[model samples]
Target: NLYFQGVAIKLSSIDQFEQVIEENKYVFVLKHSETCPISANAYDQFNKFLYERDMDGYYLIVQQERDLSDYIAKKTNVKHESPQAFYFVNGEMVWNRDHGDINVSSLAQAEE
Candidate 1:
């Protein structure tokens, strides 16, 4: 089981990642760097977005889960960036933002 703010969760394996992406109609993903101040703030905004909206989100800490991050890049064809956030629709990446752009309002508008 995985849980984070009742919206996002950490994927423990490639299988779980594939499963969730395939099963959900839409989802958000974050490439987080736990040690970076910018990443911390972006995550703060992400958390607030999740709390206010109804959506499914998943995240990976780059350092601790490099494999999963690498696989995501390979699968999604999206260049990797710490503190990056993606809004995927129908298992395809429609939009993404990095650095300071990952905020509550922007993240929430992912479904729009």
Candidate 2:
């Protein structure tokens, strides 16, 4: 069982979010709303996807880190979506997904 190397980042302030984005090797931002059932389901799918693959990245907020999420959306030009997934490589957002689309196959497809 290959576990995801990604960390669940707790953003204290907007600056911290920027710092992580600037410093991390690769970032997989997950915009999860804890209150939403759909978001919960999406997270489960994401975890399964990660468990089946080896990748380096981190997760941030859609609800807890609204400022950072917005910053990411503006910086990466990827629209905000709850339970969304964004893949960042070379400090730039390379791909993204939302809802039921968060899966290992999709991520692998994007990598290819």
Candidate 3:
């Protein structure tokens, strides 16, 4: 991890991914694709959700880290989707969304 500070972590490896889940009580994760417009849209909103909610979040670019993305799906039991999101609490996936519906309010609902 860099010395910089931000909620959305640019995921580098599966261990780092696991470490985040291990260290935090709650974490939100997203899989995004730079080549897809739909993914770009969802990715933007994901960042907004992180900023507005000021929550700890992590993301993996599907094209860059397909393995990590797939491993997360295998771990969370949420199918792999370019613009997918999972809301986790206490190491459990409590909620998920994909594509057009991945908004701050929807993700924040998991908080309340």
Candidate 4:
């Protein structure tokens, strides 16, 4: 897991994904891909955001867990995309960004 971070727990299953959102009223999830330059940078920004905020976040690798990522998209009604960021409140997605838009500032904007 080259992109794994202590601040962001890697999710591999639908149950774990569901559990996380259920347990935390507010949550952030990242759907990342392995070995993609854009995804790599987004992962870094996501890790920095989590580290600075000292908050727990969830991430699912698109290559490793396509089903899990698909489940998230199905649940949120947001089309699946690599290097995507999701902000959920009470199990509902409040904001999402993908590709070049997945950055620290864009994540912070979800709160606003």
Candidate 5:
């Protein structure tokens, strides 16, 4: 069985995203567009990654969270990309990936 720190984290505002990062210390954030097939595939890969590896910190932002997504892009200075992955440590984005590159192997390798 797959177990995760599951929560319907609503990043409705910029402050919420910042607060989450600050409180979490280390976080893996995923930006997904619910209607995109590519995003679905990437999400599946991400799920597999978590299932295979022991993960402690993770979060997700849906496309519907437009304001929050924009806030993250502006705050982190990373281009917005659906089906993207961002790793934050010490309240800073250390690494990121998007689209075709967002996969289980790539994420595992990058985190290592």
Candidate 6:
């Protein structure tokens, strides 16, 4: 279990994705690539951010869960980008940042 402070969790399947949105009032989701250096950095920052905040944060490993990643891209009308981060409220995406932009400050900005 990838639980962080009892708030962060890993979403491994599209079914879980649907359920997460249905269940949470708001959420933070990340698309991570296991082998990318950029993704590694973003993942670190994402973990750090989540560690400090008590929020519903979820992540998916892109290579392992490509279907879920693609589903999100199509659902949000946002192009697929590894190391992407999203903020959603009421099943609607509010903001997204990708690549080097996926940092604590940027993630915080999404909430603002």
Q: Which candidate is the best by TM-score?
A: 4
Task: Please give the distance, in angstroms, between residue 26's alpha carbon in candidate 3 and its true position after superposition.
Answer: 1.3
Please write out the lDDT profile of model 1 over residues 1-112, one tens digit for every residue: 2234577687767888788878988888888998999998887787778767766578889889888889988877878899998887888878889999999888767767
> Model 4, 1-112: lDDT tens per residue?
5333498899989999999999998899999999899998999999888888888899998989988988888988899889999999988889999998999899988988
Ten residues in sequence with the least summed lDDT for candidate 6: 1-10
- Which residue runs of candidate 2 sit more than 4 Å off their true CA positions? 1-9
TM-score of each: 0.87, 0.76, 0.88, 0.93, 0.79, 0.90
Residues 1-112, candidate 5, lDDT per residue (tens digit)? 3433432233566676777788876677778878889987777777677656656444455666788787778878988889888878878988889998988888787677
- Candidate numbers, best lDDT first, in rank order: 4, 6, 3, 1, 5, 2
- The digit string of per-residue lDDT tens for model 2 on 35-81 reads 98888776666666655655444466577777878887788787888
Kindly report which residue pairs in candidate 4 clash with one another.
none
C-alpha root-mean-square deviation, each candidate: 3.1, 3.0, 3.5, 2.3, 2.8, 2.4
lDDT scores for all predictions? 0.82, 0.70, 0.83, 0.90, 0.72, 0.86
Q: List model 3 lDDT by residue over 7-81, tens digit each.
A: 688887899888888788889888888899998788777787887766769988988998798898899887888
Would you list the clashing residue pairs of candidate 5?
none
Deviation (Å) of 103 in candidate 4: 0.6
Model 3 clash tally, residue pairs: 0
Candidate 5 clashes: the total is: 0
Please, what are the lDDT tens digits per residue for candidate 6 over residues 5-64? 655588999999988887888788999988999998898778778777766589999989
- Model 6 clashing residue pairs (backbone): none
Whole-model alpha-carbon lDDT for candidate 3: 0.83
Candidate order (TM-score):
4, 6, 3, 1, 5, 2
- List where candidate 6 sits over 4 angstroms from the true fold: 1-7
